[model samples]
Target: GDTKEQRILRYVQQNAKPGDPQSVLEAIDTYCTQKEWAMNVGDAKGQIMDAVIREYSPSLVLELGAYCGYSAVRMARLLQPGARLLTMEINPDCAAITQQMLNFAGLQDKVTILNGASQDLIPQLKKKYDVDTLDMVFLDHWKDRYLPDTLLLEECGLLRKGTVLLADNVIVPGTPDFLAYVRGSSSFECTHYSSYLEYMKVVDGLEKAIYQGPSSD
Candidate 1:
């Protein structure tokens, strides 16, 4: 294969059982830990995400990064019937790959990977996709895009009171500015979950923030 992404796809197709999200993720985790790193949110942080999905039980969730569909599947696998996850990915190369990854996991119906930049798609979620206020948002794209897109979601009126926003790489690569805004702003009730980077020892974490809703004038 020419790229790590393709290599991972091949590995998963061969090793993981179709329609089994547990197997698919296990294959990916093993691949990243033993083969090579490809950033799939891995097992460590994934558990934290898994717990949130279980407890929140969101009916409509938006994921900012669909990189390899790892987190997409991880979240989608837990959704009860009628729940949906809309994931945005700007990389054209991952557009189809992400879909296939979810399809293979048998989670295709639960998650839809929207191909486009976050700024472009965030607004469309309400119009084109017919999405109401999102119950939860998982942010894992470019760190700098974190703040702007969060604001975009707010301005688009996509977030309702009690909406959960979880951000990855907040401490590893770090979203210093996003962190400050979410942590300090009155609009969000924020908390931090410390964890290691995807599959490495270097420390990283996910920031969990709850939108208190649009501020009153």
Candidate 2:
């Protein structure tokens, strides 16, 4: 009853390993394809993130959302040896699940999944990680909260110049204001990449926006 792409994702989820490297990613693909569609840009978009991480070559990472931890695993692998990523997840169940998956992939030491929203945990994150010490950030949370959360991160003084922030699914279910805010701001240099939400074109388009922040305006 679904399209071919949907069927492919469903197959990937059923066959993939949850705690394995590609398992959660395949599961997310299935969840989006066969189940209710999600806006989070999947693997294809992840490649773009990989490029950003390589370019920044960050030692510390902050991810706004850890929806199943697929991207967290990806980031952990991309970071330098012994590098760490502190990722926030709004869903407790998802957080726990993601933790298990990361552990399964042998990446538990490299990634920590926090059970709270970005706003709720920003204070502790800053205190624990050192304010503005983040070298890279990935934003894949609710579209509406994207800009506000970035602003909040700025307010916490946790983002410094040359810090990389990635906003996914910004074009579909989109974040017009977030896009505009970064565009109008003189302190941030932003680049937007257009990609499909999933393998299928039916889902919303995905926009991966990389923001380098803390510049003097």
Candidate 3:
């Protein structure tokens, strides 16, 4: 929320797509400024995932949500050289727009925008990536499916011994049960990143619970 004048300025900044390396950033800001809070989801607050990717250098990253494609762009921008991200989304059109945005930002090669639910598309992902193992996972899709989708991944044996699972919007939209399950299990650990409720600040932040793998006896 800004004054009419402020919103206009932000709108221009967000809409005027910058050249490569800055285009996605500008587009996100533009959408938020012009539209009624675009659901690109993790905005400026999901940087924790970027940091994790930088440190771990995961070869294959899986993201559960791809709202309007902003988060995918963020991840693509920060991934290690040659690293690839496969992000799932429920909306085909959103997925297409995300692909266009990623391509526009020159990150198409780095990120694969998949238009399908995780449960239905995980099998296809398996064929694409092989049993290559998942290095990091960001769960930001439907709030209610976090835990179930996680378990599905586990059951599929896609999670490796040291893979990092980063969950977003846990505290904001709230993923109490998912948080509980991870915290209660000895094999996992989490880091709760905070954001103001109802976007007290201009843009809302998100939690990135980096779930550790099972511990050895």
Candidate 4:
């Protein structure tokens, strides 16, 4: 069966320049733009993510959606020598595909690919994983899962002062609920970056929220 994910894996294996994360990224972009429309957070938003990673240089990064491992590779490549990215993929099929993508980009050792839902995996990040607090949480999963997982992260003590939450697709597949919550809440310093959706002209963007610890009021 020629699943789109498998096809993407094959394309990368055949076309992408191995061991070069940049080359692998462009390869996936080439396949998605020229071949099919997949949701891997295209080049547009990638630059934004790039800027954040370079500026923050977070030691511990927790990603909720490792769909195709595009952002996983993107973030891992920019991480400092000892930094770590823990990415989760709920879909077993997508998880397998991302593993190949990470290996193809030589990031298999750089990024920790976790298999499970964010809600379940997040609870263990502190005790089971010994993650005191995450410096960043890249959310690229279901728009609806956005708010709940954030609340869960807070509950699990996974967030610390100044933790960056870079959320995607808040406009097209709009996350009005989350948009309102994060923006309205006093606990975070939220900002939005205007950008297009992956390989599309449609309007979209990323939401960057800085955790300010729990509200005093």
Evaluated with lDDT, which candidate comes out highest? 1
| Residue-level error in angstroms, candidate 2, position 16 | 6.5
Q: lDDT per residue, candidate 4, 94-209, as tens digits? A: 99899999999998886888899887888888888889999999998888899999999998888899999999988877899999999999888999998865466688989999
Best to worst by lDDT, what's the order? 1, 4, 2, 3
Model 2: which residue pairs collide?
132-158
- Structure candidate 3, residue pairs in collision: 14-30
Each model's RMSD to truth, in Å? 2.0, 5.3, 5.3, 2.0
Q: Write the per-residue lDDT of candidate 3 for residues 1-217, one digit (tens) a residue.
A: 5543234334434564543646656656665665756554544465566677788888888988886567777787887787888988887766766676676677788887778888898766677756467788888888889888888887777887777887777766578888888778765666666654454644333444454555666
**Pairs clashing within candidate 4:** none
State the weakest 10-residue window (summed lDDT) of model 4.
Answer: 194-203
The runs of at least 3 residues in candidate 2 whose Cα sits more than 4 Å from the true structure, single-residue gaps closed, are 1-39, 129-132, 197-217
Off by over 4 Å in 4: 197-201, 215-217
Provide the overall lDDT of each model, using Cα atoms, as 2-decimal numbers: 0.90, 0.72, 0.70, 0.88
* C-alpha positional error of residue 3 in candidate 4 after TM-score superposition, expressed in Å: 1.0
Worst 10 residues of 3 by lDDT: 4-13
Instruction: Rate residue 30 of model 4 by lDDT.
Output: 86
